[PDB]
Amino acid sequence: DSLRPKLSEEQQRIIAILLDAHHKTYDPTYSDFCQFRPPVRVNDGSVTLELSQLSMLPHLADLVSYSIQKVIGFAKMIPGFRDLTSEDQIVLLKSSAIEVIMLRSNESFTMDDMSWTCGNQDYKYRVSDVTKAGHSLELIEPLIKFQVGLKKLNLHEEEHVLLMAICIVSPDRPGVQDAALIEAIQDRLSNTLQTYIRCRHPPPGSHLLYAKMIQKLADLRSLNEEHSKQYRCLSFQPECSMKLTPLVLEVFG
Numbered sequence: 001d002s003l004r005p006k007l008s009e010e011q012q013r014i015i016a017i018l019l020d021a022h023h024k025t026y027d028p029t030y031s032d033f034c035q036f037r038p039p040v041r042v043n044d045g046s047v048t049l050e051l052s053q054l055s056m057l058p059h060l061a062d063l064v065s066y067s068i069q070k071v072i073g074f075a076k077m078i079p080g081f082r083d084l085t086s087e088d089q090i091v092l093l094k095s096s097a098i099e100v101i102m103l104r105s106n107e108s109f110t111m112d113d114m115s116w117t118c119g120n121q122d123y124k125y126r127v128s129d130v131t132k133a134g135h136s137l138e139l140i141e142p143l144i145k146f147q148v149g150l151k152k153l154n155l156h157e158e159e160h161v162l163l164m165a166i167c168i169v170s171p172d173r174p175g176v177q178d179a180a181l182i183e184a185i186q187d188r189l190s191n192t193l194q195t196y197i198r199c200r201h202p203p204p205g206s207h208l209l210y211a212k213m214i215q216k217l218a219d220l221r222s223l224n225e226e227h228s229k230q231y232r233c234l235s236f237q238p239e240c241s242m243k244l245t246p247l248v249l250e251v252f253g
């Protein structure tokens with residue numbers, strides 16, 4: 001009855017490994033940003049103008065690209081991940097990249113003004129800047145909802161990295177070969193999450209936290225399909241590919 005098994009020595013190594021992977025792949029100081037193509041914020045309080053200028057696209061496109069590289073880094077240090085055929089590594093990455101980016105961006109997302117703040121001012125990102133990169137409310141509003149949703153779970157960083165690992169190693173992705181193997185890696189990770197929550201999370205009356213976390217992985221598949229729907233529509237804008245990166249192109253095209 002409400003059993004609380006102690007963390008195995010393997011389960012601990014996994015956390016340590018993931019905690020460390022994240023420290024090595026996420027820069028909380030945002031010092032690489034001046035390297036990205038500069039943010040341009042034109043005036044408007046218009047889908048037409050947005051698509052005409054695409055003023056924020058090269059900055060955000062660089063930002064996402066940069067992050068994909070970071071996520072790729074992250075995945076490589078996931079225990080199990082290198083044991084997969086590099087083909088199941090590509091598939092799992094490409095189909096989760098946008099989700100892990102939405103997951104990881106929560107570190108910069110603040111409930112003070114409902115923005116991602118990586119700054120200073122210049123690297124603050126709100127609904128409007130994302131519109132300025134050619135996306136519509138149908139993605140941007142629900143993404144903000146999900147951000148708040150996630151902030152309120154109040155995840156320990158341990159839960160944050162596991163959640164991201166779990167998301168990457170999902171056996172039910174279009175095109176995976178060895179779902180059996182991938183499902184084994186995931187189970188190992190969820191068992192670590194489920195157990196970690198039970199030992200180390202206050203109160204807890206609410207270990208309900210695990211169900212809520214799995215629910216976030218569902219919300220993510222939605223935003224993923226929506227993002228991909230909208231990405232398609234940007235691709236139709238002429239001269240757009242030059243505003244992107246070779247990496248953003250392959251991952252989403």
Ligand SMILES: C=C1/C(=C\C=C2/CCC[C@]3(C)[C@@H]([C@H](C)CCCC(C)(C)O)CC[C@@H]23)C[C@@H](O)[C@H](CCn2cnnn2)[C@@H]1O
Nearest residue numbers: 025026027064067070101102104105108116125130133231
């Ligand atoms: C990507 C990240 C950040 C924010 C994420 C945002 C804010 C702007 C808007 C973003 C990029 C959404 C867009 C709707 C995605 C659009 C991509 C496109 C234009 C290619 O379709 C999805 C996630 C959103 C900021 C920050 O938390 C992180 C920046 C990168 N970083 C820092 N240290 N290590 N990596 C995070 O990965």
